[PDB]
């Protein structure tokens, strides 16, 4: 698809068998999802957003479908108002910005 | 241009007579620039993201050049660690996300 930006670039993702809404974010280095259960061990990570730094749980090698495109990569879990798909996964689905 | 997402999508902007580097940010509703003076009226605003909220000054009808493309819109000025070009100006330069 070609997605314009007049509204938020929200898509459906599938993770852990469940469907969620998420934002395609070229400004995010990483992918951050609201509290949910994921398999395996996690590692600590501190991420910085516009209002300051927050602690999250880093899960590696997680299967995730993004607007029907399959990816397997790192997902950060923590308190966020919006699920964010960052560049680590945008590059797996072959997304570019064009003007 | 086509911009890949292997790295942060940073471009040069001209704003208020100054050259700056800024992030093309599809996950930002607003354009937020580090502290600088701009002409005309402003009003206070709180904006949020990861980590909470920050107080900014809202300047309306500000011209900006983004990678060579002129646009006008609202610009927020405040203590952001990175200058961000959000959707309000990305639409004006015809930016799309493609995959
Ligand atoms: C997600 C994470 C990996 C932490 N990356 C970032 O957060 C990087 C950090 C960079 C350095 C600090 C300055 C911002 C840039 C770009 N951001 C990405 C950037 O795209 C970020 C992602 C995001 C979206 C929605 C909610 C939270 C977070 N957007 C934002 O921070 C913008 C700022 C704005 N007012 O325009 N927020 C929003 O547009 C926005 C949208 C919906 C909301 C709902 C409730 C509360 C707040 C909400 N904020
Ligand atoms: Cl605007
Ligand atoms: Cl358009
Ligand atoms: Na003005």
Report the separation in Å between the CA atom of A49 and the middle of ligand 2, taken as the mean of its atom positions.
22
- Widest distance between CA atoms in chain A: 41
Rounded to whole angstroms, the Cα distance separating B71 from B57 reads 19
CA angle B85, B88, B92 (to 5 degrees): 90
Q: What are φ and ψ of residue A73, in 5° steps? A: -170, -165
Ramachandran region of residue A40, left (φ > 0), alpha (ψ -120 to 50) or beta?
Answer: left
What is the distance in A from the centroid of ligand 4 to the CA of B67? 22
Reply yes or no on whether A29 is catalytic: no
Which of B22, B45, B50 to probe the A interface (max A CBs under 10 A)? B50
Quote the CA–CA distance of B69 and A31 in Å, as a whole number: 29
Ligand 1 pocket test target in B22, B23, B27, B31 with most atoms within 8 Å of CB: B27
* Residue whose token pair is 């942060």: B8
Q: Under a CB-based contact definition with an 8 Å cutoff, are residues B97 and A3 in contact? A: yes
Q: What is the three-class DSSP state of A89?
A: helix
Residue of A nearest to B33 (CA): A50
* Contact state of B5 with A96 under an 8 Å Cβ cutoff: yes
Q: Which one of the ligands is nearest to A56 CA?
A: 1
- B69-77/B32-33 β-pairing: parallel
Residue matched to tokens 């395609």:
A24
For residue A51, the CA-to-ligand 1 centroid distance in Å is 9
| Resolution in angstrom units | 1.0
Rounded-to-10 torsion of CA A51, B54, B95, A82? 50
User: Backbone phi, then psi, for B51, in 5-degree steps?
Assistant: 90, -5
Q: Would you say the CB of residue A49 lies under 6 angstroms from ligand 1? A: yes
Specify the ligand 1 atom closest to the Cα of B31: 36
Beta-strand (E) ranges in B1-99?
Answer: 2-3, 10-15, 18-24, 32-33, 43-49, 52-66, 69-77, 84-85, 96-98
C-alpha A34 chain-centroid distance: 10
Domains of chain A as residue ranges with CATH = 1-99 (2.40.70.10)
Using CB atoms within 10 A of its CB, is residue A45 exposed (0-12), middle (13-18) or buried (19+)?
middle
Closest-approach residue (CA) in chain B for A27 = B25
Residues of B in contact with A68 (CB under 8 A): none
Which H/E stretch holds residue A33? strand A32-33
Q: How far is CA B43 from CA B11, B20, B57, in A?
A: 27, 23, 6
Of all ligands present, the nearest one to the C-alpha of B59 is 4
């Amino acid at each position: 698809p070609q997605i314009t930006l007049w509204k938020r670039p929200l898509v459906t993702i599938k993770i852990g068998g469940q469907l969620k809404e998420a934002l395609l974010d070229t400004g995010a280095d990483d992918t951050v999802i609201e509290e949910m259960s994921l398999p395996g061990r996690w590692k600590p990570k501190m991420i910085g957003g516009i209002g300051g730094f927050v602690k999250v749980r880093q899960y590696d090698q997680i299967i995730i479908e993004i607007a029907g495109h399959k990816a397997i990569g790192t997902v950060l879990v923590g308190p966020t108002p919006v699920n964010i798909i960052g560049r680590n996964l945008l590059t797996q689905i072959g997304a570019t910005l064009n003007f």
